[PDB]
Write an enzyme that holds these catalytic residues in place. Structure first.
Site, PDB file in Angstrom:
ATOM      1  N   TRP A   1       0.584  -1.314  -0.429  1.00  0.00           N
ATOM      2  CA  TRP A   1      -0.218  -0.176   0.178  1.00  0.00           C
ATOM      3  C   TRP A   1       0.789   1.353  -0.377  1.00  0.00           C
ATOM      4  O   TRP A   1       0.635   2.119  -0.517  1.00  0.00           O
ATOM      5  CB  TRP A   1      -1.156   0.386   1.137  1.00  0.00           C
ATOM      6  CG  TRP A   1      -1.155  -1.525   1.541  1.00  0.00           C
ATOM      7  CD1 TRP A   1      -1.876  -2.052   2.139  1.00  0.00           C
ATOM      8  CD2 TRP A   1      -2.725  -1.981   0.474  1.00  0.00           C
ATOM      9  NE1 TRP A   1      -2.214  -3.663   2.241  1.00  0.00           N
ATOM     10  CE2 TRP A   1      -3.172  -3.316   1.305  1.00  0.00           C
ATOM     11  CE3 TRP A   1      -3.227  -0.905  -0.159  1.00  0.00           C
ATOM     12  CZ2 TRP A   1      -4.413  -3.832   0.578  1.00  0.00           C
ATOM     13  CZ3 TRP A   1      -4.902  -2.162  -0.368  1.00  0.00           C
ATOM     14  CH2 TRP A   1      -4.968  -3.073  -0.344  1.00  0.00           C
TER      15      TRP A   1
ATOM     16  N   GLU B   1     -12.347   1.822  -2.628  1.00  0.00           N
ATOM     17  CA  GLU B   1     -12.444   0.330  -1.674  1.00  0.00           C
ATOM     18  C   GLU B   1     -12.642   1.656  -0.560  1.00  0.00           C
ATOM     19  O   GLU B   1     -11.369   2.615  -0.704  1.00  0.00           O
ATOM     20  CB  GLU B   1     -11.559  -0.539  -1.752  1.00  0.00           C
ATOM     21  CG  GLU B   1     -12.161  -1.561  -0.781  1.00  0.00           C
ATOM     22  CD  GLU B   1     -10.385  -1.478   0.266  1.00  0.00           C
ATOM     23  OE1 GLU B   1      -9.666  -0.511  -0.141  1.00  0.00           O
ATOM     24  OE2 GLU B   1     -10.731  -2.095   1.387  1.00  0.00           O
ATOM     25  N   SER B   2     -12.865   1.589   0.541  1.00  0.00           N
ATOM     26  CA  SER B   2     -13.043   1.939   1.934  1.00  0.00           C
ATOM     27  C   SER B   2     -12.640   3.759   1.502  1.00  0.00           C
ATOM     28  O   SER B   2     -14.012   4.074   1.672  1.00  0.00           O
ATOM     29  CB  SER B   2     -11.227   1.923   1.961  1.00  0.00           C
ATOM     30  OG  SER B   2     -11.170   1.883   4.311  1.00  0.00           O
TER      31      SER B   2
ATOM     32  N   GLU C   1     -13.094  -7.577   8.631  1.00  0.00           N
ATOM     33  CA  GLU C   1     -13.262  -5.512   8.062  1.00  0.00           C
ATOM     34  C   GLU C   1     -11.909  -5.397   9.608  1.00  0.00           C
ATOM     35  O   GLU C   1     -11.287  -4.496   9.091  1.00  0.00           O
ATOM     36  CB  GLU C   1     -13.999  -4.986   8.240  1.00  0.00           C
ATOM     37  CG  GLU C   1     -15.235  -5.262   6.575  1.00  0.00           C
ATOM     38  CD  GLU C   1     -14.483  -4.516   5.751  1.00  0.00           C
ATOM     39  OE1 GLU C   1     -13.382  -3.688   5.901  1.00  0.00           O
ATOM     40  OE2 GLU C   1     -15.215  -4.495   4.545  1.00  0.00           O
TER      41      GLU C   1
ATOM     42  N   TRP D   1      -0.355 -11.652   6.210  1.00  0.00           N
ATOM     43  CA  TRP D   1      -0.611 -11.396   7.495  1.00  0.00           C
ATOM     44  C   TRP D   1      -1.052 -12.571   8.050  1.00  0.00           C
ATOM     45  O   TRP D   1      -0.918 -13.606   7.569  1.00  0.00           O
ATOM     46  CB  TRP D   1      -2.302  -9.647   7.068  1.00  0.00           C
ATOM     47  CG  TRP D   1      -1.949  -8.910   6.661  1.00  0.00           C
ATOM     48  CD1 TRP D   1      -2.218  -8.704   5.489  1.00  0.00           C
ATOM     49  CD2 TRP D   1      -1.200  -7.891   7.365  1.00  0.00           C
ATOM     50  NE1 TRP D   1      -1.633  -7.608   5.606  1.00  0.00           N
ATOM     51  CE2 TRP D   1      -1.547  -6.690   7.054  1.00  0.00           C
ATOM     52  CE3 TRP D   1      -0.675  -7.843   9.309  1.00  0.00           C
ATOM     53  CZ2 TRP D   1      -1.083  -5.772   7.232  1.00  0.00           C
ATOM     54  CZ3 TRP D   1      -0.694  -6.602   9.201  1.00  0.00           C
ATOM     55  CH2 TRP D   1      -1.086  -5.340   8.230  1.00  0.00           C
TER      56      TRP D   1
ATOM     57  N   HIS E   1      -9.394  -5.921   5.744  1.00  0.00           N
ATOM     58  CA  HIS E   1      -9.575  -4.681   5.110  1.00  0.00           C
ATOM     59  C   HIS E   1      -9.333  -4.378   3.570  1.00  0.00           C
ATOM     60  O   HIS E   1      -7.987  -4.654   3.757  1.00  0.00           O
ATOM     61  CB  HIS E   1      -9.718  -3.779   5.607  1.00  0.00           C
ATOM     62  CG  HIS E   1      -9.845  -2.912   5.640  1.00  0.00           C
ATOM     63  ND1 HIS E   1     -11.814  -2.501   5.204  1.00  0.00           N
ATOM     64  CD2 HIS E   1      -9.875  -1.036   5.514  1.00  0.00           C
ATOM     65  CE1 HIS E   1     -11.917  -0.462   4.474  1.00  0.00           C
ATOM     66  NE2 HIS E   1     -10.743  -0.731   3.881  1.00  0.00           N
TER      67      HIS E   1
HETATM   68  N1   AA Z   1      -3.063   0.653   4.621  1.00  0.00           N
HETATM   69  C1   AA Z   1      -4.100  -0.074   3.621  1.00  0.00           C
HETATM   70  C2   AA Z   1      -5.030   0.070   2.670  1.00  0.00           C
HETATM   71  C3   AA Z   1      -5.518   1.029   2.331  1.00  0.00           C
HETATM   72  C4   AA Z   1      -6.281   1.235   0.886  1.00  0.00           C
HETATM   73  C5   AA Z   1      -7.160  -0.725   1.395  1.00  0.00           C
HETATM   74  C6   AA Z   1      -6.603  -0.817   1.790  1.00  0.00           C
HETATM   75  C7   AA Z   1      -5.971  -1.085   2.966  1.00  0.00           C
HETATM   76  N2   AA Z   1      -6.123  -1.956   3.374  1.00  0.00           N
HETATM   77  C8   AA Z   1      -5.082  -2.224   4.862  1.00  0.00           C
HETATM   78  C9   AA Z   1      -4.861  -3.588   5.164  1.00  0.00           C
HETATM   79  C10  AA Z   1      -3.237  -3.883   5.746  1.00  0.00           C
HETATM   80  C11  AA Z   1      -2.790  -2.961   6.447  1.00  0.00           C
HETATM   81  C12  AA Z   1      -2.836  -1.237   4.854  1.00  0.00           C
HETATM   82  C13  AA Z   1      -4.057  -1.066   4.627  1.00  0.00           C
END
Ligand code: AA
Ligand code: AA
Lengths: 540, 540
Positions: B83, B199-200, B331, B436, B444
């Protein structure tokens, strides 16, 4: 033979009667006076021991029922009439009954003492469902049951006064227990092995005797069926008790306008009124419409109960005590047709969502609007929030958990964690002769007939499986009375009944199937009632 | 061949690059300037359209990542590095990317527009997991993704000021959507069939464009993955936004000392600071210790959002709109190693009861003690209240339901019950390559690689079943982009995907096993978050 019907007690001689069971005869002594008739100036006063008598007191039939309200909502309906008085009403009602095996036991025998329920406003030891002839015959034990004053006559309290201290109905039960200590040996019974068992308010009465020192020395074991002393209905505060007593007096013209005020004048006016007049105004003194709420109940005033049942249960030392507690599958079901909107015993009671929300305020009275929302949150199936059948079962669970299951679960866990050995059950068999509608399942009070072996009565229409099931239940209760353990002393083949602990929360299911061990007496719901809801009430 | 790597848009000419997939080539135009560089005096200001340029802009590689915090808590760990920015950081970052099939489509083709997440403080369109070559090749759609300003550069707000109005990061996304309307036809894309998906925080961005009039006319369908605009993390109030902007200014020495502190002087001082200096103090402005809370997020000020997302979602008419929503199986799991005590990605995180009670305050910040008791009441299993594995999963459910599942479930229900056709899913496949720990399950953000067809990359080590699974999901997403229905245009053989309604609440399970219909997106838990808890906080 008939020489067995002649027994002498500390008061005098008695003549009993021989009862017939399919397995042999028993000897019963019905209507033994254990107290002076609480009449005239003795109304609302603590009981006094019955003076000795000359001659032979005939003890061949049940004595009078204490004055009480009579359920007349369904004339001729077996489901209600079975709890109504089957003898004439009278204030001269402090009599007890003793069933003893035939032939009379030559060695001391454990004693079972029954305390009937009925919301502290009704009940009698003479009811057919409390016939102890089958328990005594099949299990060779000694059974005792007493009458105690109910309603205003037994629990009207003007706290602080001598003329009406309250809890005299509980003192009626205690005096009957002192009578068992002094006289049950004359019937072959062991006063060193006395097990109190009761249901509904009788179960609450047992719990209050566990928490009252002057009563703890009169018995050694306790069984609480579908009731507990810590319920929201079993006790009342001094301020509310004074108000309910004062409202009853005003409704019967006490004091006469307008000379009056203090407790001496008020009780003196109450003692001149006919007993039935006081009965006819009993339900008027409740603060709001509700179910599972009763006008005159034990009062927390420092005498009989030095603190609230919850306080005494939390601070209690119960090492060396064995308790058997339990509930039925549907504790709150029948109460719904006594006040919840949309409910009728003669239809399916498929209530709407609006009726369910209003019914929550009836089954849980005097709580805030926010607390009611918390109740609706827990008991709404949010995947089917408007399904009438689910809302029906939900409101039954609300009334049952709030009033019976969770007060019992809190008591059981506290007893087991503070010394006592506890056995828990859930009665799940619906009697085949049950006259209430099917949707009520196993209603409050309908395990009693199986505990007393009523299916053995040849005039009834129980099934063959239910007679076997009743014998197994009497064996459970008798084993607990004998040894403090419902399990058969030396029988490994039959499924075993593990004790109840605060951590594992193990209980057994009582039905036609063999014993099945389960965990948690509605732990999720009772965490709401016993843990979270008080915090919600304090903060608001 | 190479004739299709040259494209002219309104600003000038572009040269793209041919990307290779196992199924065939794709034409990509990466790093197209859609805005003027928001640098110098343009910092914190809404974007200006990119001025026309002479010659050919080289669009063969991704452009710079917008300035943002970099996760350095696990150097070299794939789970976090994937990420982090894979290009240089620069305020000159307002570029977008276009993937188009080869050969170029001759008739207008439905357009997918991706908005990356990252808590509005991080993210980039250049990440390997957002590579749109497999989605464009397998389904022959036009895919677009843009960069938008994150953190203080995109969402620092002194509300009411002209120098830092806020929401400029959302305006960056809107400008890119206007760019798609004016230029996507040159790539074969249909500007009348534009499906937003993210997403998110990207999903929260999509939801805010649905609720903003000037953006709603720039697209026609929406896909919200693991995010909603009504979440407790997606927006912030005017007063709190001003406090965070003023705290950040103080940490970097603004105002200097001895001068005023109005919005014009304060923003002017912030403009003289290097960009990295602002990034270094972003986390030091949050109100308290927490997880799933971000410093600079969209502000509710009456401009971009005339009211709160919750209020606009309630009063919104959504007839004619098709929406696809969903969440992953776990999540809140990964967030726990970022603040909750006792948690570590390198052990089993078998927390104690005390750590669970403290973690609830970190996962649910700024709620009263009574509110925390209500959360503990709902999420504790009172038959095993201290089982470490259950407590670890419970706190994951606390964070996930509170931040994602219940905000999404509420939006989907209000959209369905107010005109829109909604489809819902739960992604339940944990990737075989997931780095992980196993107890995090499906964390998530780990459905994105399957939506983008990343398992098809032969340099990766996905299983053959995961490749087939990715082709199913790309078909689902493309069908929804094409027809507004994830089901095949005509295929009753394969299991069907029923729409989401507020009554039935049906959704499907996305995993290696064929589609399975289920009902209720955490209906019991989300009734606590969405219905009861607001009433608890309001009455305290
Ligand atoms: N920085 C992260 C994320 C950023 C945007 C969308 C999903 C993401 N998931 C993650 C999952 C674990 C660690 C960091 C994450
Ligand atoms: N009056 C009643 C009871 C009194 C004492 C104990 C149990 C009871 N169960 C009942 C069940 C249904 C109706 C009336 C009932």
């Amino acid at each position: 033979e008939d020489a067995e019907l002649l027994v002498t007690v500390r008061g005098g001689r008695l003549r009993g009667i021989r009862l017939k069971t399919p397995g042999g005869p028993v000897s019963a002594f019905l209507g033994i006076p254990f107290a002076e008739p609480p009449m005239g100036p003795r109304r609302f006063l603590p009981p006094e021991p019955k003076q000795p008598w000359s001659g032979v007191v005939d003890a061949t039939t049940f004595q009078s029922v204490c004055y009480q309200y009579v359920d007349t909502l369904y004339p001729g309906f077996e489901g209600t009439e079975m709890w109504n008085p089957n003898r004439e009403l009278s204030e001269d009602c402090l009599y007890l009954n003793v069933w003893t095996p035939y032939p009379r036991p030559t060695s001391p025998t454990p004693v079972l003492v029954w305390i009937y329920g009925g919301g502290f406003y009704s009940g009698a030891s003479s009811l057919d469902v409390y016939d102890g002839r089958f328990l005594v015959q099949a299990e060779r034990t000694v059974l005792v049951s007493m009458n105690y004053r109910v309603g205003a006559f037994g629990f009207l309290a003007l706290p602080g006064s001598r003329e009406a201290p309250g809890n005299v109905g509980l003192l009626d039960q205690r005096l009957a227990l002192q009578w068992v200590q002094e006289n049950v040996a004359a019937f072959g019974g062991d006063p060193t092995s006395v097990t109190l068992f009761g249901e509904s308010a009788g179960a609450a009465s047992v719990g209050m005797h566990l928490l009252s020192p002057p009563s703890r020395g009169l018995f050694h074991r306790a069984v609480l069926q579908s009731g507990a002393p810590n319920g929201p209905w079993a006790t009342v505060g001094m301020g509310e008790a004074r108000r309910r007593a004062t409202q009853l007096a005003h409704l019967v013209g006490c004091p006469p306008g307008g000379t009056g005020g203090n407790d001496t004048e008020l009780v003196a006016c109450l003692r001149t009124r006919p007993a039935q007049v006081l009965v006819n105004h009993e339900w008027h003194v409740l603060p709001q419409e509700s179910v599972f709420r009763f006008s005159f109940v034990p009062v927390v005033d420092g005498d009989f109960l030095s603190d609230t049942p919850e306080a005494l249960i939390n601070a209690g030392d119960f090492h060396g005590l064995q308790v058997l507690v339990g509930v039925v599958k549907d504790e709150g079901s029948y109460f719904l047709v006594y006040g919840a909107p949309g409910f009728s015993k003669d239809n399916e009671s498929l209530i709407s969502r609006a009726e369910f929300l209003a019914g929550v305020r009836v089954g849980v009275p005097q709580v805030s609007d926010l607390a009611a929302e918390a109740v609706v949150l827990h008991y709404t199936d949010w995947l089917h929030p408007e399904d009438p059948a689910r809302l029906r079962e939900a409101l039954s669970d609300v009334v049952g958990d709030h009033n019976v299951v969770c007060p019992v679960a809190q008591l059981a866990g506290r007893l087991a964690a503070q010394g006592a050995r506890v056995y828990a059950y859930v009665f799940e068999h619906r009697a085949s002769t049950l006259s209430w509608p099917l949707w009520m399942g196993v209603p409050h009070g309908y395990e009693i007939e199986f505990i007393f072996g009523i299916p053995l009565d040849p005039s009834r229409n129980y099934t063959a499986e239910e007679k076997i099931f009743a014998q197994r239940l009497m064996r459970y209760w008798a084993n607990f009375a004998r040894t403090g353990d419902p399990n058969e002393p030396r029988d490994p083949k039959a499924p075993q009944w593990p004790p109840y602990t605060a951590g594992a929360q193990q209980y057994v299911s009582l039905d036609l199937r063999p014993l099945e061990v389960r965990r948690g007496l509605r732990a999720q719901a009772c965490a709401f009632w016993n843990r979270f809801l008080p915090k919600l009430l304090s903060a608001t």
